[PDB]
């Protein structure tokens, strides 16, 4: 099976995904023109398209942390995460021994 989703470039999606295509969500069977064979699936996609159409001065201490690179560092550098890093490594140390 193929996603066969209608891309903005006019070509059907050729991604080979078992269940879900990341750029188009769930994968449903489609014909040569990229139309879902199930009429219910066509209606659901139309509803999704309608929903999409409907849709001091200096950075404070909290505002400075509000970004991408800080968020990933906070998750990586955590008391529970570091302990889980050690705890996971302890279990392979038992396997190594």
């Amino acid at each position: 099976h193929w996603c066969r989703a209608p891309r903005p470039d006019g070509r059907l999606c050729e991604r080979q995904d078992r269940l879900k295509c990341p750029f188009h969500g769930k994968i449903v069977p489609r014909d040569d023109e990229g139309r879902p064979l199930d009429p219910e699936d066509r209606a659901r996609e139309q509803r999704r398209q309608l929903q999409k159409q409907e849709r001091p001065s200096l950075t404070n201490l909290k505002a400075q942390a509000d970004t991408a690179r800080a968020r990933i560092g906070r998750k990586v550098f955590a008391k529970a995460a570091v302990r889980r890093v050690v705890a996971a490594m302890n279990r392979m140390d038992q396997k190594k021994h």
Partner: protein, 58 residues
Amino acid sequence: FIINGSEKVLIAQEKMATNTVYVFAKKDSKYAYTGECRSCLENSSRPTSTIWVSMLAR
């Protein structure tokens, strides 16, 4: 020996070899692997000095 009219025998005591490099490990410790060497002059000039090289657990 005969100490105060009593026959006494000294019993051999087992000890780790000196001046030899040992690598041990403790399953529950902050050191993953520890290297040990109980160094001592061939002529026993002084009590043996133990040096430890270790490896902190991540």
